[PDB]
Amino acid sequence: EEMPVDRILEAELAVEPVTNICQAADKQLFTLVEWAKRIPHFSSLPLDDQVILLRAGWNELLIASFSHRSIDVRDGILLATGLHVHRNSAHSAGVGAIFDRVLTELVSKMRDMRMDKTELGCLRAIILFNPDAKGLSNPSEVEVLREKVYASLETYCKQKYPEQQGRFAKLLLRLPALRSIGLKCLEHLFFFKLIPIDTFLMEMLEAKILHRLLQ
Amino acid sequence: VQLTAAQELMIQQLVAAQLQCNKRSFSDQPKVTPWPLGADPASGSASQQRFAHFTELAIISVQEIVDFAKQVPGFLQLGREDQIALLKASTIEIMLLETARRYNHETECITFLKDFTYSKDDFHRAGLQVEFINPIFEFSRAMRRLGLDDAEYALLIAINIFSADRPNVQEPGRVEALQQPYVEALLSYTRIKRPQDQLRFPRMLMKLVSLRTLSSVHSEQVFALRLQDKKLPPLLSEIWDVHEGSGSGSHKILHRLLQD
Ligand SMILES: CC(C)[C@@H]1CN(c2ccc(CO)c(S(C)(=O)=O)c2)CCN1c1ncc(CO)c(C(F)(F)F)n1
């Protein structure tokens, strides 16, 4: 294949109250770059474009990885810092609504589908290769890579879950939910900025670290 | 691989419902504030007229969307609070789909109702902003490349309505169950229309993601209108939460439109 599902799976495996979330975010940003490098053809893109994609996508990408990570947790999510967060805490911090949307629309759905790792990685690769991100030197190139992920993912779904006729569609239909959830989470991250933050995360919220880190 | 009779008849029903709705919208063309003609008076009234013109078109659009929803099989079996919640969120998204559908790539103009043809600049003269205008046209261009027919558009509109993740949806499991047949029908329809192009269907579904962004870009536009003291009519204020009183939903205008 042009976008081998194997190599995508390798990338996910290769990567193993409010302030705790921001701590967890800053650390995962580093891991994310390593993940993006392991995605086929990502490193082959122009450096300025690799930057643009990660700046546009890092938010949805992280939410997806921690959602899937939290499949075993009950009424809570598991952060990369190792720390847990629970409903009760989230509502105490005025972040309860967005928290419940994440559990209902991502963690729950992922659990009930028994969404596997390959499926996750492909969705993350789709998010990553976003041709609508502003300032790309060649959006077509990026559009083409996303489309290969479509094909590889669907193929995978028909092979591994032949009985599940609508599985491919079910996976893609999480993305609109994820986009809207991503916009609301970003909103909160901006409020935290306005009111104890870490360095890389700060760079992502700002309109250098990232450049060096992928050379 | 194959289209069920049931499926064919459902698609047929949706397509028919849209044409019936379009016809009603054209009836309301004389209702619209005329688009100002001649050189603009210093009074500044041409601007207010262009803005009122567009605003009225939007109103009709909302009526058109409500009329359509009621004819989508299943929609009326939901509770009235969810019908409202689904339309509030999707109105702008559907508006944008319907907008793209009326884009001409040769004139780079969009045609509303029968013959209200407007370019980018017209949109700007009407009081919208470039940060909103440009994405609308980018999205129309994108849609045109896809080459959708009336059936694909209708189906996508139905699917968009039955998104269970909208705010204040009390019975989300019911909405996903409704959405699924429409998704299945679109898979079948597009795979029969274009068997040699497997990417057509994921391409379409991914437009629902674009529309979440555009809904947000539109929020940034509403913010600018308030800032410019452009007041919106009740219906649009209700649906998009703009002004005190109507924005809180105390008028129940949408409720009423459904009631009929
Ligand atoms: C610019 C577009 C996206 C929207 C909707 N638009 C429209 C869309 C679809 C259709 C077809 O049903 C029609 S029409 C007149 O029914 O042919 C108009 C009419 C004008 N529109 C509009 N959309 C948003 C806003 C404000 O956010 C405003 C205004 F500022 F005028 F109030 N107007």
Cα–Cα distance for residue pair B77/B81, rounded to 1 Å? 12
Cβ–ligand 1 distance for B152 under 6 Å, the answer no
Mutational test site, ligand 1, from B48, B49, B95, B133, max ligand atoms within 8 Å of CB:
B95
State both tokens at A159. 């092979």
How many structural domains does chain A have?
1
Burial of A198 (0-12, 13-18, 19+ CB in 10 A): middle
Q: Is the separation of the CB atoms in B214 and B139 below 8 Å?
A: yes
Using CB atoms, pick whichever of A176, A177, A183 lies closest to residue B216.
A183
User: DSSP letter at B41?
Assistant: P
Domain ranges for chain B, please list them. 1-260
CB pairs under 8 A between A and B: 52
> How much distance in Å is there from the Cα of B208 to the middle of ligand 1?
19
B202 contacts A183? CB cut-off 8 A: no
How many CA atoms are closer than 13 Å to the CA of B10, on its beta-carbon side?
21
Q: State in words which class domain B1-260 has.
A: mainly alpha
Q: Which residue of A has its CA nearest to B165?
A: A177
The experimental technique used to determine this model is: X-ray
The alpha-carbon radius of gyration of chain A (Å, integer) is: 17
Backbone region of residue B245 per phi and psi (left: phi > 0; alpha: psi in -120 to 50; beta: other values): left
Q: Are A171 and A157 in contact (CB under 8 A)?
A: yes
Of B54, B44, B40, B143, which is closest to residue B96 (Cα–Cα)? B143
Instruction: Output the six-digit token pair for B132.
Output: 């909103």
Strands in B116-119's sheet, in edge-to-edge order, are B103-104, B109-112, B116-119
How many other β-carbons are positioned within 10 Å of the β-carbon of residue A177? 22
Closest to A5 (Cα-Cα) out of A167, A118, A133: A118
Query: What six digits make up the tokens of A4?
Result: 């081998």
**Three-class DSSP category at B216:** helix
Cα–Cα distance, A170 to A168 (Å, whole number): 5
Contact B181, B190 (CB under 8 A): no
Please give the Cα distance from B124 to A37 (Å, whole number): 42
Resolution in angstrom units: 2.6
- The contacts of residue A107 (CB under 8 Å, 6+ apart) are A67, A68, A70, A71, A73, A77
**Per-residue CA distances from B247 to B44, B166, B243 (Å):** 27, 18, 5
Atom of ligand 1 nearest to the CA of B240: 27
Check residue B128 and report its DSSP letter: -
What's the CATH number where A126 sits?
Answer: 1.10.565.10
Q: Is the CB of B90 under 6 A from ligand 1?
A: no
Interchain CB distance below 8 Å, A176 and B163: yes
Residue B149 half-sphere exposure, CB side, CA atoms within 13 Å? Answer: 10
How far apart CA A157 and CA A119 sit, in angstroms, is 8
Can you list the alpha helix ranges (DSSP code H) found in chain B?
Answer: 5-27, 45-71, 80-101, 120-125, 130-146, 150-161, 172-193, 200-227, 234-240, 253-259
> Between vectors from CA A197 to CA A91 and to CA A186, what angle results, nearest 5°?
55
Is B197 in contact with B123 (CB distance < 8 Å)? no
The answer to whether B145 and B67 are in contact (CB under 8 A) is: no
Residue A24 CB burial class (10 angstroms; 0-12, 13-18, ≥19) = buried
Q: State which residues form the domain around A63.
A: 1-215
- Kindly tell me the number of DSSP H helices and DSSP E strands found in chain A: 12, 2
Both tokens of A37, joined, read 């490098």
Per-residue DSSP letter, A76: E
A179 touches chain B (CB under 8 A): yes
